[PDB]
A paper describes a structure:
Assessment of the Michaelis–Menten kinetic parameters of these evolved mutants revealed that the mutations that improved one catalytic activity caused a concomitant decrease in the other, i.e., directed evolution produced catalytic specialization.
However, [name] has new side chains installed proximal to the pAF residue. While in both crystal structures, the mutated M19 and H93 residues are close to the reactive amino moiety of the pAF residue, the R92 side chain conformer varies significantly.
Author numbering:
A (entry chain B): 4 to 70, 75 to 110
B (entry chain A): 4 to 70, 73 to 115
The structure:
């Protein structure tokens, strides 16, 4: 499994979490650890690296709670990319099914 | 849509095509366009570039076939078939994680 694929899989998971709803880093690590039955356990510094890029590209934004803790939210643009990406990957599944069909 | 994602998708179809059976560049362009009902149009020069990478990594190899004429075909190696299995398994696990994220969510509601 190539390095590019584990990065892509990690990205997909984080963005799906925020689509479930706003959340914070320590909450994101816990939720993921228990949904993989302990298999996937993310590192603080890793999430920070990925969030800097996503916030630079306008995909997510952050704000304060109880104003102590820092929350993250999927932006307007962000929701749009989720839909584009899901659509393209759906069409590919049909194409492959059809390559074998005409076969 | 990121470049790496379209790059990954084209990679994915191409390897699936060879998994259907051996093929050559023009047939690969032909076979895909008719299964996409004309929608998808692959570039020759890209395929030339993309097939070099896969052969460098031991994923595909080629041999000579007779058309009449004489054509060059491409074939998926063992290493290729094993990566196909690995790739499918990992992405199955990712789908499970997503399945459980929404369940534990609905469980907190109650």
């Amino acid at each position: 499994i190539p390095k590019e694929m584990l990065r892509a899989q990690t990205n997909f998971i984080l963005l799906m979490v925020l689509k479930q709803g706003d959340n914070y880093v320590y909450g994101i690590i816990k939720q993921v650890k228990e949904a993989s039955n302990g298999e996937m356990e993310l590192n603080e510094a890793t999430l920070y690296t990925i969030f800097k890029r996503l916030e630079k590209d306008g995909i997510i934004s952050s704000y304060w709670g109880d104003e102590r803790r820092k929350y993250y939210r999927l932006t307007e643009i962000g929701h749009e990319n989720m839909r584009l990406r899901h659509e393209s990957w759906s069409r590919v599944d049909k194409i492959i099914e059809n390559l074998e069909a005409n076969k």
